[PDB]
C-alpha cells in the first residue's frame, strides 16, 4: 500500500477527509456537518460519538469520490479543532457525556478560581499559555466535578480523557492506542512544553489522576495501524498527528523561524515559527509548540481571534439577515456607506492581544443611514482589524520585520476582504493555492513517517505559489479606519455589566 | 455470525439502503440523491456512475448508523427504477453515455416508427406489453443511434446493456458477474414473459445484438458474491433482484392472485398477482412477470400512473407553489374551496388506463374564487382519481373483486390523502406500519435464498399491519367528485400535441 496518503481534518461544526497522491493533488474529498449544542448561553458541546460518525462518513465519502482502495493508502494523517475535550469509559468505549468545545465558556468558574487562587504565572511558564476556559484543563475539571461519580471512577483507572485527535486515533485502533501529539497536548493547559511532559503540580492542583493522560508524541510518527475491521479489511498506518492551526503552518511550509500565517475559519488563528527557541518575549500572546519531528522540537508564537467565521453564521441564524454564508460577500460588495460603522463580535471575551473574558459583542457609529450592507461589510472587516492587533503585537514582542503574511481557510476565499486584510496591514498577503492547507499539513506530516516524502526540501520544490495582494491603499484612509478600530473596541471594553 | 441483510433500493431520484434483522426490523438506514439531467423537454438522464457513487454512500452510511459490521451480513438484496437504460464497456467498464430515465421520451420518434410499422399486437403478444418510450427496447435502440461508434462496438461484442440492478450487481462483482432478475427483464419489452427468453424477433427487429444481453435469472437465489473492495471490506452474498414495484408487492406479502397494492412515489404504481398464469384479458393495463421464485413464476397485472410525487416537486421547483414537498399536506388542509377544481398531471401523457402519449398537464374548472390552497389539494386528488380508474379497470379485466387495497411509498404518509382515496374507491385502503415496504421486498428475496427465512410462512408471521382507512364519504359526493375528473380527463385528451 503506497500511492496515496489520507488526511482528516475534524473541525468545530465539520469534518472532512482528502485523498493526495505523491504530487500534493486532491484526488478526492468529502465533507460532513455534525450537530452543535447550546445547553446555556455560552455553553457549547458536541456528541463525541457524532463526531465520530461524520469522520466514518467523510473517510468514506473521499474513497467513493476518489474511487482508489484502501489498500492504496501509504498512510493517514489526522488534524483536529483543538482544545475540545473529551472522556470515555475505557472499557465500554462511551463518552461520560457530551464533549465540552473549545469555544465553550462552562468552565469559567474554575478559570476565574485558578486566577484568584494566583496560578497565572506558574501555569505560563509550563505552559506558554493563559488560564482561562478555553484550554482542556478546566473542561476536564468541570466534567469531573459534574458527572454523577466520574471523579470516583477517574480514581480508579477506568476513565481516560483526551483531545479529538486521541479519541479518534482511539476510534480507529478500538481502543488499542490512547495517544496525542505534542501540539495538541500544549494545547491542554495540562503539559509542560519546555521539559515536555505531563505536568504533575498541575494535576494535583486540579485533582486529575495522570491515569487518563494519554502518551505524548511527534507530530510524525507511526503512532499504529487502524484495526482491519475500522478500516474495510485493511490495516493502515497513522503516522501524523497536529492541532489544525499547528497543522496549517507546516501546510504553508513556514518551517523557518519568523514565517508567519493566518488561517480564516470559525476562528482566525494568527501563528509564527519561532524555532527551537521560544527565546522572546510573548507578552499578550501564547507559546505553545507548532510541531516536534526529526528529534527536535519547534515552538511557536500564536495570537486567537475566537470568532471570524462564526460571526457570519451569526448573521444567519441569530439576527437572519443574510440568507447564506457566502452571500455575505456579495451584501459587503455594495456598501455605499464611509467605513464608520464598526462590528466588535467579542460573543465570548476578545481573544488575543486584549484577552478580556467579561467583554460581549458590540456595534459603534450607527446612525439612520447605515444600511444592511454597511452592517455586513462591518462584521466581515472585524477579524482583518483584530488580525493587524495581533500582528502588531507580534512584532513588538520578537522585533522580528514581516513583510509578508500567508493566509488560508475557506474565510479566505473573499478577495475583497483579503485586498481588505492587506490594505490595513500595509503588507503583501499570499493565499494558497488550495485553501485546504490545514488537510494538506497532516498529510506531509503522515507522508514523511512513511517515508512517501524523503524529506523537508522535496516537500518545498512540491509548493505551489498562489494568488498575491499589495497595499494599495492612502495611508490617511488606513490609520483613520484602524483608529476607529481601536476605540470602538476600547468603548467594547468599557462595558461589564454584571447583574 | 450473521443476523442482518442489506436491501439497496435504487430509485429515480434517490437511492437507498437499509439493514433489517431476523425481525425484519430496520437497524440502519441511509438515503442521498443524485443528479437529474433534462438536456431537450421530455428528455430526462441520469449519469449511471453518479447513480454507482450515491449507492456507494448509502451502503456505507448504513453501516454507520447501525453500527453493524460487514462481516456480519447474511445477504443483499437489490431494487431498482425499472426500465432505465445504461449501455457499457464491457472492457474499461465506462458508460457510453448517460444512461435514459423510464420518465424520458427521447425515444418516442423510435416507439412511434414501430406502432406504425404495426407491432403493437405482436410486442403485446410476446412481452405483455405496449409499444411506448417508456421501456427499455428503444432507449437501447436511441443509444446505439445516437452514440457514435456504439452499434459497431455492439455488433463486436464490446457493449452490454443492462437495466440498473444489471448495472449495480456488475459492480459489486467488479465485472464478474452480468445478470437480470424476471421482473427487470420483463419490462425491458426484449423479453418474452411466455417462453421466458430473450425474444429474437424483437431482437433482430430493433438490430439489437444479443451478446449485449445479461442472464435472466429469478427473483430469489445467490447470484454471486461482492469483491471485498466493493462492499465496505467483505465478500458477500447478492440474494435478491426485482424491480422496485414487483419487490413492493412482495414486501405488502401479496403472495396470491387478486392480492393487489399500490406504491406512492415519484409514480404511482398498482400491481396485482395473478398467479402461475395471467389468464385473462388485460386490455388498458400491463401484464408483466411479478417474480420467479420455488422454480415458479407468477404473474402481474399492472396500471402505471407516471406522475404522482413528480407533481409536488414541480409545485415546489417548477411554479414554486411551495417551499418544501411536506408543505403540500399542509396547504390541502386549508383548501376552502367546494372540490370544483381538477388538475391531471400528464406531463407526459396520461398513463393507465389511458396510455396516450399526446396528452399534457391541464386544470380545469378554475374561477376568480380558486386559491393556492384550492390547486395544491387538487394536483394531490389527482393520483386518487387516476387509482380509481385503473382499480376499475382491473376490475372489468379480471373479474375479481377488490374489497381491500393495500398502499405504501413516500407519499402514503399523508393520512388525509388515504383516507381521500378510501372515500372515492368506497374500498378498505390499509397503509403499510413500515412506508419503505420495496426495501422490505427485497431483503426477504434476499433472506430467503441464503436461509436467513426459511419459507414464505414464515414472512407471513412477522406481518404487523399498518393504520387502516374506511370509507366515510356519502355515496352522492364520491360520485360526483368523480364525475367531474372523468370530464376533466375527457377535456385533456381533445387537446392532441403533435
Same mark, same amino acid.
Given at each position: ?70 489498500? @492504496?493508502?501509504? *498512510? ?10 473529551? %472522556? #470515555?469509559?475505557? $472499557?465500554? =468505549? &462511551? ?58 471512577? @477517574?480514581?480508579? *483507572? ?10 479518534? %486515533? #482511539?476510534?480507529? $485502533?478500538? =481502543? &488499542? ?323
Amino acid at each position: 500500500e503506497k500511492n496515496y496518503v489520507m488526511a482528516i481534518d475534524q473541525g468545530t461544526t465539520s469534518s472532512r477527509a482528502i485523498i493526495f497522491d505523491r504530487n500534493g493533488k486532491k484526488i478526492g474529498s468529502s465533507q460532513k456537518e455534525f450537530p452543535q449544542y447550546f445547553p446555556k448561553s455560552g455553553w457549547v458541546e458536541h456528541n463525541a460519538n457524532e463526531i465520530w460518525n461524520s469522520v466514518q462518513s467523510v473517510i468514506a465519502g473521499a474513497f467513493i469520490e476518489s474511487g482508489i482502495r484502501p489498500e @492504496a493508502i501509504a *498512510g493517514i494523517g489526522i488534524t483536529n479543532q483543538r482544545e475540545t475535550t473529551v %472522556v #470515555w469509559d475505557k $472499557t465500554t =468505549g &462511551q463518552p461520560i457525556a457530551n464533549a465540552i468545545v473549545w469555544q465553550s465558556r462552562q468552565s469559567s468558574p474554575i478559570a476565574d478560581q485558578l486566577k484568584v487562587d494566583g496560578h497565572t504565572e506558574m501555569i505560563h511558564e509550563k505552559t506558554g499559555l493563559v488560564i482561562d476556559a478555553y484550554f482542556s484543563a478546566t473542561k476536564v475539571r468541570w466534567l469531573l466535578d459534574n458527572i454523577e461519580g466520574a471523579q470516583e471512577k @477517574a480514581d480508579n *483507572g477506568e476513565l481516560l480523557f483526551g483531545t479529538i485527535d486521541s479519541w479518534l %486515533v #482511539w476510534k480507529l $485502533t478500538d =481502543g &488499542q492506542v490512547h495517544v496525542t501529539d505534542y501540539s495538541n497536548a500544549s494545547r491542554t493547559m495540562l503539559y509542560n512544553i519546555h521539559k515536555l511532559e505531563w505536568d504533575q503540580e498541575i494535576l494535583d492542583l486540579l485533582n486529575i489522576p495522570s491515569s487518563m493522560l494519554p502518551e505524548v508524541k511527534s507530530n510524525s510518527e507511526v503512532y499504529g495501524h487502524t484495526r482491519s475491521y475500522r478500516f474495510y479489511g485493511s490495516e493502515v498506518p497513522i503516522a501524523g498527528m497536529a492541532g489544525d492551526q499547528q497543522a496549517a503552518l507546516f501546510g504553508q511550509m513556514a518551517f523557518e523561524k519568523g514565517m508567519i500565517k493566518n488561517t480564516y475559519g470559525t476562528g482566525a488563528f494568527i501563528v509564527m515559527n519561532t524555532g527551537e527557541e521560544p527565546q522572546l518575549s510573548d507578552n499578550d500572546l501564547l507559546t505553545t509548540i507548532g510541531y516536534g519531528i526529526n528529534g527536535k522540537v519547534y515552538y511557536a508564537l500564536e495570537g486567537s481571534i475566537f470568532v471570524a467565521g462564526s460571526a457570519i453564521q451569526w448573521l444567519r441564524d441569530g439576527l437572519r439577515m443574510i440568507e447564506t454564508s457566502p452571500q455575505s460577500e456579495e451584501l459587503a460588495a455594495k456598501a455605499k456607506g464611509d467605513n464608520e460603522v464598526y462590528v466588535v463580535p467579542a460573543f465570548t471575551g476578545l481573544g488575543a492581544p486584549y484577552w478580556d473574558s467579561e467583554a460581549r459583542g458590540a456595534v459603534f457609529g450607527l446612525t439612520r443611514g447605515t444600511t444592511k450592507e454597511d452592517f455586513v461589510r462591518a462584521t466581515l472587516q472585524a477579524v482583518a482589524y483584530q488580525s493587524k492587533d495581533v500582528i502588531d503585537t507580534m512584532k513588538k514582542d520578537s522585533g522580528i520585520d514581516i513583510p509578508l503574511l500567508k493566509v488560508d481557510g475557506g474565510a479566505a476565499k473573499n478577495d475583497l476582504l483579503m485586498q481588505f486584510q492587506a490594505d490595513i496591514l500595509d503588507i503583501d498577503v499570499q493565499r494558497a493555492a488550495n485553501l485546504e492547507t490545514t488537510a494538506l499539513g497532516a498529510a506531509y506530516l503522515a507522508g514523511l513517517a512513511v517515508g512517501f516524502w524523503k524529506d523537508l526540501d522535496e516537500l518545498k520544490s512540491m509548493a505551489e505559489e498562489g494568488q498575491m495582494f499589495t497595499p494599495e491603499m492612502p495611508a490617511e484612509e488606513r490609520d483613520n479606519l484602524y483608529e476607529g478600530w481601536k476605540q470602538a473596541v476600547a468603548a467594547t471594553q468599557t462595558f461589564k455589566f454584571k447583574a
